[PDB]
Design a protein around this ligand. Structure first.
Ligand SMILES: *Sc1ccc([N+](=O)[O-])c(C(=O)O)c1
Length: 197
């Protein structure tokens, strides 16, 4: 089968690397869903379909969701919780199971929607992987390590290219990291002591 990947938030900066790594995989079809598609970086891979839509437009999202195998969400901004709920519902409506969901801020009250998004994903019964990246750099490197749900981050930063590489490895082999909620950091970027607030 063709492997149908839906990229929600496809104009995002991590998304752009994923799209690029997906561009020469001739057995993937990638659907690129974005609010403002005319600001999706060019040229447009031949295995792509570019759809204008907002994840809170439930009708648009269901249309895009039909027939998909793997959802990759790189969602930002207000109401991330409402957004996650909308993604879960559309996956369930369209019989799609596999979700890769990035939670990156881009402690405190603005984390509540993020926590509520994460909790909703963990309670969804979907085949999920939640990805939790350290501070994002634009360094041209792939250098990372992973921490589990209840472990502290072993580092301070991680390249977007690193996070894209993980996403792509999961898309390539989607049986990996099912049911996990993983921190991603560059090795040897642990913070100086002591700590301050
Ligand atoms: S992907 C999807 C969403 C909704 C519906 N629906 O019938 O309301 C369908 C479908 O046509 O089976 C598919």
């Amino acid at each position: 089968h063709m492997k149908n990947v839906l990229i929600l938030g496809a104009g995002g900066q991590i998304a752009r690397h994923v799209i690029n790594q997906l561009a020469d995989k001739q057995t993937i079809k990638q659907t690129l869903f974005a609010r403002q598609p005319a600001k999706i970086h060019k040229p447009y891979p031949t295995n792509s379909q570019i759809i204008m839509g907002d994840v809170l437009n439930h009708a648009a999202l269901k249309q895009a969701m039909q027939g998909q195998d793997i959802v990759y969400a790189n969602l930002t901004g207000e109401d991330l919780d409402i957004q996650a709920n909308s993604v879960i519902a559309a996956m369930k409506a369209c019989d799609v199971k596999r979700l890769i969901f990035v939670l990156s801020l881009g402690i405190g009250e603005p984390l509540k929607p993020f926590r509520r998004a994460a909790d909703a994903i963990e309670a969804s019964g979907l085949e999920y992987t939640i990805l939790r990246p350290a501070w994002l750099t634009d360094e041209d490197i792939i250098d990372y390590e992973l921490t589990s749900r209840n472990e502290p981050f072993k580092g301070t930063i991680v390249s977007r290219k690193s996070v894209a590489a993980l996403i792509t490895d999961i898309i390539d082999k989607p049986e990996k990291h099912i049911g996990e909620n993983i921190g991603i950091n560059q090795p040897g970027t642990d913070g100086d002591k002591p700590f301050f607030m």
